[PDB]
């Protein structure tokens, strides 16, 4: 792997992550792709997704709202992040070279082209996943856990 | 690419319901939801 066009395929933009805020198999379908997390001035640093963590701070991202961060790592430096700082821009040439240098310095073997090719299909097959099982209940529960009740047309129901 | 969008009953939020899927809202969880206005040329003659 040495091209940015082939690496941007698994780039999880900010618009796609809004449809898997509460979908199961999150750690299995997300762990593997790369994101252009913003550090901050316009420089960016691509990091690897090691797992998933829940932060104690709740924040609203446009319409929805979640409290799940993203344990990332850029070669050696690792820390907690959030899904609101991720940008929708693709991996530029400078950022690609920076990520390659960081990987070569850390020693982590670069992913394989076939690995990326077989992993990018995961998001595709998960997007068109039929909600036939009993996951809607868990989704609505996790949503209402943070979404306050009074809002808005259910005030009478809540009072009753 | 039309996943058929619906509007919840009490929440008035948009939802994407495909075929062979339950009719429920993404949140709260109701069993009522209406459709959205068509995209055709709804033209009237103020007569």
């Amino acid at each position: 792997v040495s091209l940015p066009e082939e690496l941007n395929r698994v780039r999880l933009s900010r618009h796609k992550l809004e449809r898997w805020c509460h979908m199961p198999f999150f750690a299995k379908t997300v762990t593997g792709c790369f994101v252009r997390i913003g550090i901050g001035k316009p420089v960016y640093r691509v990091a690897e997704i090691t797992g998933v963590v829940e932060t104690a701070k709740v924040y609203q991202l446009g319409g929805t709202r979640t409290n799940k961060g993203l344990q990332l790592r850029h070669g050696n430096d690792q820390r907690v992040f959030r899904l609101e700082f991720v940008s929708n821009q693709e991996f530029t040439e400078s950022e690609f070279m920076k990520w390659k240098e960081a990987m070569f310095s850390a020693g982590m073997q670069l992913p394989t082209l076939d690995e990326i090719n077989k992993k990018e299909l995961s998001i595709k097959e998960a997007l068109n996943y039929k909600f036939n099982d009993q996951d809607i209940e868990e989704i609505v529960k996790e949503k209402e856990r943070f979404r306050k009740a009074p809002p808005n047309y259910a005030m009478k129901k809540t009072q009753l | 690419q039309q996943p058929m969008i619906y509007i919840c009953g009490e929440c008035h939020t948009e939802n994407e319901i495909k075929s062979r899927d339950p009719i429920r809202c993404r949140e709260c969880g109701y069993r009522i939801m209406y459709k959205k206005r068509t995209k055709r040329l709804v033209v009237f003659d103020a007569r």
Binding site: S13, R14, H15, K16, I37, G38, I39, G40, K41, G62, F81, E84, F85, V86, S87, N88, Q89 | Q1, P3
Partner: peptide, 17 residues
């Protein structure tokens, strides 16, 4: 309807906070 970005909606940074 995959990602209607059209750029974006002002992405916040980490160090800015």
């Amino acid at each position: 309807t995959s990602t209607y970005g059209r750029y974006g909606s002002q992405t916040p940074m980490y160090g800015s906070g």
